[PDB]
From a paper:
Genomic and biochemical analyses of the [name]-7 strain have revealed that the bacterium secretes at least seven chitinases, one of which is a unique high-molecular-mass (150 kDa) [name], termed [name]. This enzyme has three surface-layer homology (SLH) domains (~18 kDa); it is specifically expressed on the surface of the bacterial cell and degrades chitin. Based on comparative sequence analyses, [name] has two glycoside hydrolase family 18 (GH-18) [name] catalytic domains (~42 kDa each) and one carbohydrate-binding module family 54 (CBM-54) (~25 kDa), as classified in the Carbohydrate-Active enZYmes (CAZy) database. In this study, we have determined the crystal structure of the bacterial cell-surface enzyme [name] and demonstrated that this elaborate monomeric enzyme is composed of six distinct structural domains.
Crystals of [name]-CD have been obtained and preliminary X-ray crystallographic analysis of the crystals has been reported. In this study, we have used the automated model building software (Buccaneer), and the structure of [name]-CD was completely modeled by the program and the structure was refined at 2.03 Å resolution. In the solved structure, the two clefts cross each other at approximately right angles. The Ig-1 and Ig-2 domains might serve as linkers or scaffolds for the two catalytic domains.
Numbering used by the authors: 559 to 1416
Write the structure that this text describes.
Amino acid sequence: GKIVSYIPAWVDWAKDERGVDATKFTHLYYAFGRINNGKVVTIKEDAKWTEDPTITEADRIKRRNNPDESNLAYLTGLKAKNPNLKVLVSIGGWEAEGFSDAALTPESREVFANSALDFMNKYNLDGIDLDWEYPVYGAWGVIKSRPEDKANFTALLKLLREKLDAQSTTTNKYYELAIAAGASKTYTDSVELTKITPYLDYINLMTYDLHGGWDPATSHHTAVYSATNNQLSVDSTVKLYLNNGVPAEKLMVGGAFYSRVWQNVENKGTGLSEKAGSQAGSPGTIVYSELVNNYINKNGYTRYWDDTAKAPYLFNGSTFISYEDTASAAYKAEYIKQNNLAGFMYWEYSQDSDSHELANTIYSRLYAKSGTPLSVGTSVYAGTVTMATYTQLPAGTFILPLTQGTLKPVISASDVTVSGIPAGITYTVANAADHRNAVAVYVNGGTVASNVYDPIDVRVVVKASAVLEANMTDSAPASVTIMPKFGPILLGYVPGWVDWTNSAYKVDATKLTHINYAFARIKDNKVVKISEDINWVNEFPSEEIREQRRNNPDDANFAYLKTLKQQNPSLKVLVSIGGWAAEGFSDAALTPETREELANSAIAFMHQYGFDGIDLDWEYPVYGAFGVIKSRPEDKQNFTALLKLFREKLDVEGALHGKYYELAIASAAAPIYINSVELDKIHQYLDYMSVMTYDYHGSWESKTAHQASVYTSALSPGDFSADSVLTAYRKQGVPASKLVIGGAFYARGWVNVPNINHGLFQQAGDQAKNPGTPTYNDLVKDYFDKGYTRYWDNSAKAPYLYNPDANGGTFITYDDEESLKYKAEYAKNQGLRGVMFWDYSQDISGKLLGAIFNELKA
C-alpha cells in the first residue's frame, strides 16, 4: 500500500521548524522541477515562476534564490529515518509550460528525457513523476497544447522508461516512473491509458478540485463517493479509469490537504448543493492548517458531514468550504483497501496542521489490519475541575479531543458514558465549542453528597456510535479529575545526605505540600537508615567518603523535618525506601512472610522517625536496571502483593492513630518498566505515582536529545516526553489523579557534539569528558555565562545549551524555570495529582521551585 506525499519546493526544508516525518509515507514527490529550453531544471530557474506579477517584489526576491539544492539534500537525507523511502522529482504542476514543445519531436523528447535523468541522478532520486496539466486541451488554454500531445505523451513516457530501464541494467537499482492524471473524462480522452500504463509504476489520480467556485452550485471537491449523479468523486474517477482498462493495482487515489471555497452561497439548508453567486472576492482555497486554526467549528462556521459522499464541509450562511479531514481520509483509505488500489497520494504535505494530523491519519488508517476494528482514541485538553470547598463543586468542563476517530458534528447524550461524577451532580455531553473533534463534558455547578478530601476520578467513554468512521469500537475509558479544594501536590525530594540543620539553604515548607526523604534502605529484610547500607556507604574505596556516609546526618535531619512539620502543619513528609542501586526488594517481595517482615519493619521505621507515609523506590522490578539490582520475573506480580500489604498495614496504622498514612512509588518512563509492573492493578493501593519524566537520554547514547522534555520534539517523532510517558500510563489504565509529573534540577549532556543545529539531535563522539549530571547550581556557576548559549525547542518546550568550544562541542539538556512552568501547566490541564522534583539540594536559588509553585498554586 503506497503513500505518495507531495512536498513543495518553495518551503526551505532545512530551516523549517517542524521538518518532515517520512516514517508516515513511502514516497516523497518533490514539487516541482520545471522545463526551460526543453530541459528539466530547478524551480528557481523558471522565470515564469520566479517573476509572477501576483504576490510580487518582497516575496519575488525569495523565489529567485529558492534553496532547491539544500531542499533535495534535506529530503533525501530523510532516508536515515525511513530507509525504504523513495524520493522522486515531480516535473510540471499547475501552469508549468514546455511539455507540448518538449514532447513534440523524437529530438526534443531526447533532450528533455536526458535532462530528466540528469536531474534524477544529480540529486540521488528514485524516480521521475510527470505532472503535465494537461495534454491536448492544455487545461483550456492555461498551457500551450496541440492535438498531437496525445501520442507525443506516449512516446515521451516510452522513451523515459527505456532510459530508466537501461540505467537499471547497469546499476541494478529499479527506477520509478509515474504521472499525476486528471480526473475528468476529457483527460481520459486526451491520453492513451492502455498504451501508457505498461510504462508506469502507477498513476496518481488527481481526485481533488473536482468541483469548485467555477461551478454554479456548491459541491464536494475531493469526496470518496458520488452522492448525486452529477457529483464527481474518487469512486467515479477510479471507475472511469478501471473502465478504460487501468489495473486497480496501478491507481493511487488523491486527497487534498486544502479546501475549495465558494462565496455568496444562498443561505438555505447546509449550503451544500446550493447556488453560489460571485466568486470575484474569493480566496478560492484555504489550507488545512488554516481551517483548523480559524474555521472548523470556529468563528461562526458549522461543520457538516455528507454521509453519502463521506465528505466534510463547513458553512457559515454565506461561505461554503469543502475540505478533507480525518473521517474523509479514513473512508478514502478504506476505499483503497476494499478496491485493491495502489494507495493514497496527497497534495501537499506542508498544508497539514503543525502536528501532521492528516498525514498521520492516512498512515494509521492505511496500514490498519482489517478484521481488527479500531477503537476510538482520546486525549485531554481540559482535565481538571476543582472543588471550591469540601462539598461545593463549581461549574466546569472536561474537554477531550479525539486522536482516533471523528465525532459526528452533533453528538447525542447516548454517544458518551461518563462514570464518577459525584452523586447529585448533573452533567451533559456535547461537542466542545471551538474544537474540530472534541467531547465536552459540562459538569453542572453543585453540592457533593459527602466531603471531598481526595481527587475524584471521572471516566469518559466515547462510544463507537459518536464517531463518523465505519467499524470502530468504544474508547478506552478516559481519565479526568475532580480535584479537592487544596489543589495539586508539589512534592520535593529532599536528600538525607545534606545536613539540613547546618545548611544555610533550608527547605521551603510553605511552597511544598510533600517531601520525600531520600532514603531509607533494606538490610536483612528490615528497613534501616542509609548509613547502615553497606553497599552505599562503601560505594567508594576512599575512607573520607565512607566516613561521611557512615556519619550520614539522619537523626539531625529527622529533628529538622519534625520542626518543619511543626511550623507547617499541613506538610506531609514521607520516607523513601530504596532509590538507585538499593538492594533487597526482589527478596523482600517473594513470599507472604518476607513481605510481612518488610512491611512491619517499614511501618516501625515510619513511626520511629516521624513520617506521614512511605514511598517505595524500587529501581526496578524484573530488569533490575540491567543487573544493577537483583531481579526476578516474579517481581512483577510480587510488587503488586507488596503494595497491597503495605497499604493494608498502613490502613491498620491510620485506623489505630486516628490519621491517614500515604503510600506512593516513584516509577520510571521506559517501556520495559511499564511492561514490568502491573500498573492497572497497583494504582488502587497508591495515593500517586511519582513518574520520573526525565533521564530519557544521556551519556550512555551517542546521539543528543532532550532528557526531560515535557512534549515530544517535532524533530524527533516518537521520542520520550512527559506527555508521551504519562499518556502511556493512562493507557494502562492509571487514573490521571494518581500521576505526578517529574522535574529534574540537574542536567545531562554529551561532549564531542558537532556544531550543527546547536548540537540538538546530532551524533556525538567519545563521552569520557562528559559532564555527568551537573546540578542547576553547577549550571549557574560554570555554564550559563561561560560560552554556552541557551536555546529553546519550542515544540518540546525544553531548553538546551550549546558551547562549540567546550570539549569538542557540548550540548546540555535540562529543566529551567520555563520548562518547569510548562510541566506544572501540563499537570493542571491534564488532571494530574501534581508535580514532583529531584532534588531540593540542586537549586539553592529557589528559582526552580518558585517556578513550579507560581504556576501550579496560582
